[PDB]
Amino acid sequence: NQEVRFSRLEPEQRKALLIEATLACLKRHGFQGASVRKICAEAGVSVGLINHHYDGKDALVAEAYLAVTGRVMRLLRGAIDTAPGGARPRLSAFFEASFSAELLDPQLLDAWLAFWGAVGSIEAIGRVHDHSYGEYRALLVGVLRQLAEEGGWADFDAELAAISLSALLDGLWLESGLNPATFTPRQGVQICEAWVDGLEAGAHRRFR
Amino acid sequence: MNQEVRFSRLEPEQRKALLIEATLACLKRHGFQGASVRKICAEAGVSVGLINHHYDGKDALVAEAYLAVTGRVMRLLRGAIDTAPGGARPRLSAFFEASFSAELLDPQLLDAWLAFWGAVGSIEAIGRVHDHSYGEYRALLVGVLRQLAEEGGWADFDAELAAISLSALLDGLWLESGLNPATFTPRQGVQICEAWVDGLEAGAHRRFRR
What we know:
Chain B: Residues 13-73 form the HTH tetR-type domain. The structure is a homodimer. Chain A has eleven helices and no strands.
């Protein structure tokens, strides 16, 4: 009865259940302890069923990382895409989304941590990182080029400025998860807005 | 058979050192969730009878490693501030240089920090190592940001919030160097940090009040 019952679920639903089991096992066991046998016992499905769709642990883990990062990117792109009057309203919309409960909640931190640990070893995972971190900076690069044009800053290295702002957001996201009482989500927005003020006040010059 | 001259002969502080390094190697290979005192002894090359006997458990070995690692970073970062030209910007620049030097930018330890940070949420003792050491790291940066503000002389600068911003930037940059060393050079990381200070000095320090 397991061979039919999993299979009769909708594709997006089968996929979501396996990624949820991969995430739970990464939390409990770390990347090195996750196995397809654990993931399938967590999911409540047969291992033979899964061997057909996935190569192994690396493939399951990569699909989970792809989905989590895809989700972030949709919320952040959505925030920009619905923002109005130009570069700073767009950055603000981004900063607000970044420190919303959706993105700031540390539920998945151990997963992220597990993902980041596997980046240096597994090409499948290393590639998801490079792709997603580049997609993420490309979004900031766009709005920073827009901001430079408004400025209009002569030869602004938007790529390096994007590495700066992404690093700040990352650092704030991480510290927040390690202890949420260090600063409030609103202080997080305020810090990011101060960084953009800093550029408009003349720091753009340091970025070529 | 080298717990005989590798553990038998040494002082308790020198066997602590050995255990700290076995704990870090075990964390890099098994993760925190997968590490155990047995797997720690497997790295030390000594028996687990021995180390049960002399130690409380895994949580306590990992907290000791965490304390050693953070202690060392802080020594080096304090050193760089103490031996820099007296002024606020030269002290910050020395901090940035130390931060992106091969010693603190060593990607080998990334795995160790990742394992500590995962233990922070579920093990309160590790949590408390985090809070304390992050507290000390920021206190160092608040002292020099206050010097900066006084040189400036900025009326009501929230040097505490400024220090959270700057620590966040450093953390973020350190993490990206380790996840992909090709993204930007150590020189560029310094440059990004100086650019942040420039930003403050250019007038962004005004946002640090509300």
